[PDB]
């Protein structure tokens, strides 16, 4: 017997002291070494209600990742609305590492072992674990990178589908690699290669799983209707450089069975003047570094907001923005409770 409670968790990882990489520097003092032998007790005949949209584990992880970026990534000059903060801006190795969240003495994390569980309903097959699995704190928009694939089939996640003001999280069952590349000598010009033959095959499965929640009507995709550059295009950080990828021919689709040259390429650019997700305004970074910048990631999730109005067709446009929704993509089956 337990109750839904909230406490201050501690993070766990495998940060290496020899590594000069940002996440390794942060997780070697703010976290503890990962336990070599994690135990897990499987429990049946016991149900439990979950809610990823009201999970304290997310707000804590959010407060930790924002501290990771305020600790290391220091831009040249930073605007505070009216004042400036001019510091030093040296380049650094940027690559997210798996971070586990555990409970102190007196608390236990509950894990939902239900395959097709979205994150709001009750779970019949629930297990108890001391720590969460490997979660990479990757900050990105529109497309979720380096996460966990669906257990068996695509799972649709949303606070409420009938509400158009709530972002939608898609849990892909099969991943699609992206071959992003910034060649070295045209210095701003970047690339992003996606297998279009398997993209329209995996995007159609997303629609069909979504069409089940919408009275058997057609579904059309389109680029976002507006906003800042951090949300209107595929924003993600790779090798310390902030990428901005146009995904016009990526959400250029319609749905019946499937609908949509060389494989689809996404024109990207590197901006030194970006809007921080820390919520302190706009900042300017040092110019891009020489060499071949390549960022091979994995598409595992999509962030959507249903274009609503007075409709028989539903329009879905990409756009996450709130990175708190990114952690929910993995912390959906976890909840901190207080023992007896």
């Amino acid at each position: 017997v337990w109750k839904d409670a909230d406490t201050t968790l501690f993070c766990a990882s495998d940060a290496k002291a020899h590594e000069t990489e940002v996440h390794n520097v942060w997780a070697t003092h703010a976290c503890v070494p990962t336990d070599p032998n994690p135990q897990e007790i499987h429990l049946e005949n016991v149900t439990e209600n979950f809610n990823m949209w009201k999970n304290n584990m997310v707000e804590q992880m959010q407060e930790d990742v924002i501290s990771l970026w305020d600790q290391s990534l220091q831009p040249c000059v930073k605007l505070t609305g009216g004042s400036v903060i001019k510091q030093a801006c040296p380049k650094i190795s940027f690559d997210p590492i798996p971070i586990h969240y555990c409970t102190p003495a007196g608390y236990v994390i509950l894990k939902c072992n239900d395959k097709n569980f979205n994150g709001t309903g009750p779970c019949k097959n629930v297990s108890s674990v001391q720590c969460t699995h490997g979660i990479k704190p990757v900050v990105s928009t529109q497309l979720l990178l380096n996460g966990s694939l669906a257990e068996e089939e695509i799972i649709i996640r949303s606070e409420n589908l009938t509400n158009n003001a709530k972002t939608i999280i898609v849990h892909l069952n099969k991943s699609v690699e992206i071959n992003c590349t910034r060649p070295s000598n045209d210095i701003r010009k970047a690339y992003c290669e996606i297998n279009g033959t398997k993209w329209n095959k995996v995007l159609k499965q997303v629609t069909e799983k979504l069409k089940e929640h919408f009275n058997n009507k057609t579904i059309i995709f389109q680029p976002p209707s507006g906003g800042d550059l951090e949300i209107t295009m595929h924003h993600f950080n790779c090798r310390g450089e902030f990428f901005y990828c146009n995904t016009t021919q990526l959400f250029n689709n319609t749905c019946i069975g499937n609908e949509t040259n060389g494989t689809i390429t996404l024109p990207c650019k590197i901006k030194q003047i970006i809007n921080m997700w820390q919520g302190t305004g706009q900042a300017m970074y040092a110019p891009p570094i020489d060499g071949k910048i390549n960022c091979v990631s994995n598409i595992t999730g999509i962030l959507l907001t249903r274009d609503g109005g007075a409709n028989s067709n539903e329009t879905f446009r990409p756009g996450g923005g709130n990175i708190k929704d990114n952690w929910r993509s993995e912390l959906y089956k976890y909840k901190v409770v207080q023992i007896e």
């Binding site: 009938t162 509400n163 158009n164 003001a165 609503g308 109005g309």
Partner: protein, 207 residues
């Protein structure tokens, strides 16, 4: 999702109990309620089926489940007579208007011939008044030399005058100078409900 507000207009005496409806098409959710008095922006009353907002009297009681919803006002105040809208997310209802109920009132029908100064403009407009009446269900016909008009007249009714909760209305029949000088008798048949006989006020061309 279809939000159907019935009946659209409700006559309630100041102190009686009012009951509005909001039968939705797709259920399994909640509903809000918005009040709008003329001259002021709409105000939130009830959110999530049955929850009041800040600075709202307890006389406003919400309820309902599934598809059927209802807004009830225990003892209607004199300031509660306004337009009420219901909301589901982005969708709204057409709105119901709370009306002050009172005894019937016979309209005092008046007719005004167009001015000679007006005839110099090339057009002629004759109007009817029939002010102070209840309810706002009237029927002005406009008959010139026993000829019925349809498509050349506009009426304009005022909201209930709070001092007696009565109406007024004003039907204006506009014609050209050439068509006005062609005829003689201009009548105005009024079919309300006060007195079984349709009151008709008329005048002949000249004086």
């Amino acid at each position: 999702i279809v939000l159907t507000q019935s009946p659209g207009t409700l006559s309630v005496s100041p102190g009686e109990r009012a009951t509005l409806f909001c039968k939705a098409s797709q259920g399994g959710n909640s509903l809000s309620w918005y009040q709008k008095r003329r001259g002021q922006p709409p105000r939130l009353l009830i959110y999530d089926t049955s929850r009041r907002a800040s600075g709202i009297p307890d006389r406003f009681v919400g309820s309902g489940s599934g598809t059927d919803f209802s807004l009830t006002i225990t003892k209607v105040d004199r300031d509660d007579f306004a337009l009420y809208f219901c909301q589901q997310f982005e969708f709204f209802g057409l709105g119901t208007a709370l009306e002050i109920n009172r005894t019937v009132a016979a309209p005092s029908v008046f007719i005004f011939p167009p001015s000679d100064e007006q005839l110099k403009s090339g057009t002629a407009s004759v109007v009817c008044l029939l002010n102070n009446f209840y309810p706002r269900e009237a029927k002005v016909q406009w008959k010139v030399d026993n000829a019925l008009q349809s498509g050349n007249s506009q009426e304009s009714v005022t909201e209930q005058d709070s001092k007696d909760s009565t109406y007024s209305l004003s039907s204006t029949l506009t014609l050209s100078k050439a068509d006005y000088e062609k005829h003689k008798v201009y009548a105005c048949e009024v079919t309300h409900q006060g007195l079984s006989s349709p009151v008709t006020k008329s005048f002949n061309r000249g004086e």
